[PDB]
Design a protein around this nucleic acid. Structure first.
Ligand SMILES: [Mn+2]
Ligand SMILES: [Mn+2]
Ligand SMILES: [Mn+2]
Length: 430
DNA sequence: ATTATGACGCT
DNA sequence: AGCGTCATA
């Protein structure tokens, strides 16, 4: 009764850019705006690999992971922008710099957690309290929430989509108790007002549109964000969770999209997140371990405690390249040439990082894949990173992997390498 | 022959 | 430390 924690202590948002690499290319090239468009890496193998897709192109069935030649079969007029190539490899610098643009704007509203190149979580709890205090019992007008969906509404006793959005919002605001500064529903609502402001600033100052979710924790914020993409934000209330989760496939929840999620389904013989409520915490711990079990027990009730970390910068800087099929590296000088290419890009990015962010990486991780290995990385070794010098770093990387060569004579490399990866880690202030 | 990343958890 | 899992453009 008075003691069950309801996980409504925080207001958390997740802001995620719409079709992000496409928007970066569309800002740069106005000819691509309002068109079926995709961003592609490489070209020679089946037209290149698609890694981002405009919403116009999604209507034709184009997706990420698609080869551009196959995408062209679905959408003949699909426009394509190519990822930059430098030193023999895809180079994602334009998108990393566009990301920084957005992260720096978000950081004006609150401390953010960078969660990917195109999204960040925001803990808005403190900001909400302050916006509430200067509101002074003022109701929140629908005009302050022009792009907001309230999940689960309208409901109960118009066939257009913007009309439905407003009816839901009206029901939500009609039910609110703006008199209570400690009311979670009110706090989420004010949270949504702030996120409209944040999203407006992002679009105003970069030209990029985004979506967002507002809830009481990260997992619900992430889920909410996706519910009404693109260019809209969604509020998922604590009260909306039972209905939402009652038909929500388990795999849809962040962290459950892989093997653990499949095991929850198989072991418990269930399909939907809501079905998890019928197991005791000990039961879930018994199958999925102490941490996962407790996490699942709270999550299916809409409760999660993972904090929004104060980290705006990536904590690693890495360079990697696959060498598929018959391009696998089979000679020493080949291996060394590509270690140098990767190292030169790493040096460039590292030197820029040091000047911008007052830190130095101290560890170099070197990873390779060998032909005939199922897994993504075959071998991972670390060595000291003491100087931002590409030739030193590549020479060092070679030294850590020299012995992986199974060939008798030194000139050949066997079995051939299908992946090289250099990653700088363990930053210290400088 | 989706590729190029990046964070977190386990032992 | 090195490996595995999960995630995102
Ligand atoms: Mn996105
Ligand atoms: Mn994203
Ligand atoms: Mn995506």
């Amino acid at each position: 009764g008075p003691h069950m924690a309801t996980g409504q202590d925080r207001v958390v948002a997740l802001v995620d850019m719409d079709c992000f690499f496409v928007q970066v290319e569309q800002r740069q090239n106005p000819h691509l705006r309002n068109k079926p468009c995709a961003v592609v890496q490489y070209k020679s193998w089946k037209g290149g690999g698609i890694i981002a897709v405009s919403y116009e192109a999604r209507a034709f069935g184009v997706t990420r992971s698609m080869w551009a030649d196959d995408a062209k079969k679905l959408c003949p007029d699909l426009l394509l922008a190519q990822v930059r190539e430098s030193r023999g490899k895809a180079n994602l610098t334009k998108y990393r710099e566009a990301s920084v643009e957005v992260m720096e704007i978000m950081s004006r509203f609150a401390v953010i957690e960078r969660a990917s190149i195109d999204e960040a979580y925001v803990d808005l709890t403190s900001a909400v309290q302050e916006r509430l205090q200067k509101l002074q019992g003022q109701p929140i007008s629908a005009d302050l929430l022009p792009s907001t969906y309230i999940e689960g509404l309208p409901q109960g006793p118009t066939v257009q989509k913007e009309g439905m959005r407003k009816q839901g919002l009206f029901q939500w605001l009609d039910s609110l108790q703006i008199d209570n500064l400690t009311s979670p529903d009110l706090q989420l609502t004010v949270g949504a007002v702030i996120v409209e402001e944040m999203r407006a600033a992002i679009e105003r100052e970069t030209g990029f549109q985004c979506s967002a979710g507002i809830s009481h924790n990260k997992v619900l914020a992430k889920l909410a964000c996706g519910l009404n993409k693109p260019n809209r934000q969604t509020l998922v209330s604590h009260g909306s969770v039972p209905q939402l989760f009652s038909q929500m496939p388990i795999r849809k929840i962040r962290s459950l999209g892989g093997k653990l999620g499949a095991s929850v389904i198989e072991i418990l013989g269930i399909e939907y997140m809501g079905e998890l409520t019928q197991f005791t915490e000990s039961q879930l711990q018994s199958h999925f371990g102490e941490k996962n079990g407790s996490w699942l027990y709270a999550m299916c009730r809409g409760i999660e405690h993972d904090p929004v970390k104060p980290r705006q910068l990536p904590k690693t800087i890495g360079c990697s390249k696959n060498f598929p099929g018959k391009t696998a590296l089979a000679t020493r000088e080949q291996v060394q040439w590509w270690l140098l290419q990767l190292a030169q890009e790493l040096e460039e990015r590292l030197t820029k990082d040091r000047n911008d962010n007052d830190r130095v990486a101290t560890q170099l991780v070197v990873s390779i894949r060998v032909q005939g290995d199922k897994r993504l990385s075959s071998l991972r070794r670390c060595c000291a990173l003491t100087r931002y010098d590409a030739h030193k770093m590549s020479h060092d990387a070679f030294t850590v992997i020299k012995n992986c060569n199974t060939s008798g004579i030194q000139t050949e490399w066997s079995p051939p390498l299908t992946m090289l990866f250099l990653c700088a880690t363990k930053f210290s202030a400088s």
